Design a protein around this ligand. Structure first.
Ligand SMILES: c1cnc2c(c1)ccc1cccnc12
Ligand SMILES: [Cl-]
Ligand SMILES: [Cl-]
Ligand SMILES: [Cl-]
Ligand SMILES: [Cl-]
Ligand SMILES: [Cl-]
Ligand SMILES: [Cl-]
Ligand code: NA
Ligand SMILES: [V+3]
Ligand SMILES: [V+3]
Ligand SMILES: [V+3]
Ligand SMILES: [V+3]
Length: 129
């Protein structure tokens, strides 16, 4: 599923991401924009053999199981394919664990490089929330 901007903002808000660990909603929308272009089916391989999955490009090295990332963890206790669902619940629940881990949203490279320090509120402008 390719979410619309405000549709995703609403879903993220309902699932408790607005201000989660101090990250306003626009941060999460901005992250999703640059990680996946709001496409729940997005996947991308990493040089280390791990793969990033879904709307927030969660990585198999640590967070989910894909059966093909030797030596990896599955900290979210889910198959990576669950992160490609039209329903973002699994991705959000896993993101909450990630962002609570020490480095906050810096875990998302696209967030640090394209969202951090910018006017992230623009990503939710116009949405009925
Ligand atoms: C989505 C998924 N993975 C990535 C990015 C965006 C951006 C940069 C990057 C650099 C190294 C490895 N993976 C990624
Ligand atoms: Cl915001
Ligand atoms: Cl990439
Ligand atoms: Cl497996
Ligand atoms: Cl594995
Ligand atoms: Cl959803
Ligand atoms: Cl933080
Ligand atoms: Na894994
Ligand atoms: V990657
Ligand atoms: V840690
Ligand atoms: V402002
Ligand atoms: V503009």
């Amino acid at each position: 599923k390719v979410f619309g901007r405000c549709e995703l903002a609403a879903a993220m808000k309902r699932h408790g991401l607005d201000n989660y660990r101090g990250y306003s909603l626009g941060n999460w929308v901005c992250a999703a924009k640059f990680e996946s272009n709001f496409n729940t089916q997005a996947t991308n391989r990493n040089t280390d053999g791990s793969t990033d999955y879904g709307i927030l490009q969660i990585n198999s090295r640590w967070w989910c199981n894909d059966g093909r990332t030797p030596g990896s963890r599955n900290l979210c206790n889910i198959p990576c394919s669950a992160l490609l669902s039209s329903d973002i619940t699994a991705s959000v629940n896993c993101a909450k664990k990630i962002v609570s881990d020490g480095n906050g949203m810096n875990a998302w490279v696209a967030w640090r490089n394209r969202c951090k320090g910018t006017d992230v509120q623009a990503w939710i402008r116009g949405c009925r929330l």
